[PDB]
Design a protein around this ligand. Sequence first.
Ligand SMILES: O=C(Nc1cccc(-c2onc3ccc(-c4nn[nH]n4)cc23)c1)C1CCCC1
Length: 234
Amino acid sequence: ILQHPDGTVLKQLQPPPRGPRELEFYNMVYAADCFDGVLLELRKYLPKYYGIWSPPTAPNDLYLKLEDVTHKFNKPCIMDVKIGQKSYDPFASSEKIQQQVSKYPLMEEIGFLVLGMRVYHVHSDSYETENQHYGRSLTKETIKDGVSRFFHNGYCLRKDAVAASIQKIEKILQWFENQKQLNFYASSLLFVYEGSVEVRMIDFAHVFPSNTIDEGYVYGLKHLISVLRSILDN
Ligand SMILES: O=C(Nc1cccc(-c2onc3ccc(-c4nn[nH]n4)cc23)c1)C1CCCC1
């Protein structure tokens, strides 16, 4: 992800087939002549899409031009959470499945994985960053405290941001409970709050047509909501 001053991010397409699939996803959703009520509603929860972009002198180098969801914040606190019970898609080989489950074998049980966070700390005027090994080290015993860490800001637990996060996730869940045409694998929620709320769906390299509820994604959202709810009792 490259941040542009104009309030956008440029995401370089991942190698095939992932990058092309993510392009086609954005193209389908933001199709100008689209009057599909499900897809129109979905736009609210995605970054705004500004189309494919490539450098003037390099047509080979493909990017997506997306809304920077963090742009309107002064000191954004950011957390990326991968959602679902399976991080592999319906066309993965046995080895790919093994690779994906190996990456975090608790995905089925918990239904989400923290990819990382950046937390602004007022007292030090500095950022605490956690990488992918942080979330992958979390178990059922430590997931609540693992998530809570994100909301430690301003000499307190930011229960305001926790409650707001629940409310925004709930709307996304409502969308998922009113559609059976898309299933989402290895996609994320980006959480942002002001450290000095946004919750948006990102990363669509493994979104596929379906004729069923995305039960794994729903499970993930519900468990995430349950964890966040518990944090409100801290
Ligand atoms: O700091 C982080 N992430 C971050 C930082 C700043 C801006 C944005 C971001 O803002 N709008 C976005 C729209 C789409 C995408 C995206 N990424 N992959 N596909 N699409 C990203 C976007 C994200 C990470 C590292 C630790 C905590 C999580």
